[PDB]
Amino acid sequence: HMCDAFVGTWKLVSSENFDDYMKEVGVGFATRKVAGMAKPNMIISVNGDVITIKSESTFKNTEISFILGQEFDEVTADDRKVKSTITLDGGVLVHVQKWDGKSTTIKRKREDDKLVVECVMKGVTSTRVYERA
Ligand SMILES: Oc1nc(S)nnc1Cc1ccc2c(c1)OCO2
């Protein structure tokens, strides 16, 4: 019942500062414009110890499966090749991506009927709010 309250199908309903987050990560102009338009659905499921997070949008479809605390390789929607580790910290999924000597952290939490995603690169935060689909 690890992650029960995250499981389901979620749709993006608001975003703030995502362009600035993407700039801080190193995303180029054209990818930022097309990625910033997307309204992804996030689909989260759990089978035993394996958590799967899918993102489906008109920009890119992605899928990661992982065990908490166990590093994995991830190709992000913006085409970075990163090494990722996801843990649970006080009920928050904390996802750290490392590449090219850089690091970004993505936190996913349940707040009321929302799933809130906070993306941080250095001093820049983007907040992306999802509701049940
Ligand atoms: O649109 C998205 N929304 C959520 S919450 N997560 N991933 C995505 C997909 C995505 C697009 C562009 C990006 C990125 C990730 O990282 C830097 O540039």
Side-chain angles (χ1 to χ4, degrees):
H1 293 265
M2 70 144 208
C3 296
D4 281 359
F6 293 101
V7 165
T9 308
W10 300 91
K11 59 183 186 277
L12 183 73
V13 301
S14 68
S15 183
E16 289 289 350
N17 301 292
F18 190 56
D19 191 62
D20 268 64
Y21 171 78
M22 288 190 286
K23 285 182 173 183
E24 209 68 3
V25 167
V27 183
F29 179 91
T31 300
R32 292 199 314 280
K33 296 299 112 159
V34 168
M37 289 293 298
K39 292 286 185 161
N41 297 135
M42 180 173 46
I43 310 134
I44 301 177
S45 60
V46 179
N47 181 328
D49 290 336
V50 180
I51 304 166
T52 300
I53 302 178
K54 296 178 83 165
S55 180
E56 302 191 332
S57 72
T58 73
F59 171 53
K60 205 73 51 159
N61 300 315
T62 62
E63 176 179 333
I64 60 172
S65 292
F66 58 91
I67 298 171
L68 295 169
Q70 302 194 3
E71 183 186 315
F72 61 97
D73 285 312
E74 176 182 7
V75 177
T76 64
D78 64 304
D79 286 318
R80 289 170 287 128
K81 293 56 102 175
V82 311
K83 289 187 185 305
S84 287
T85 311
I86 303 179
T87 59
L88 216 30
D89 172 28
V92 178
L93 284 166
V94 181
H95 179 177
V96 183
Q97 298 176 331
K98 301 301 193 185
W99 79 105
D100 292 359
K102 304 172 186 134
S103 188
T104 188
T105 297
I106 303 157
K107 292 183 183 178
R108 297 174 177 100
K109 63 180 67 141
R110 275 297 304 277
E111 290 185 19
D112 304 311
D113 285 323
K114 297 166 165 27
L115 192 167
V116 178
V117 185
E118 293 172 359
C119 301
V120 176
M121 176 70 182
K122 291 160 66 195
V124 177
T125 303
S126 172
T127 300
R128 290 172 64 91
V129 178
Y130 291 75
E131 282 176 354
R132 285 199 187 268

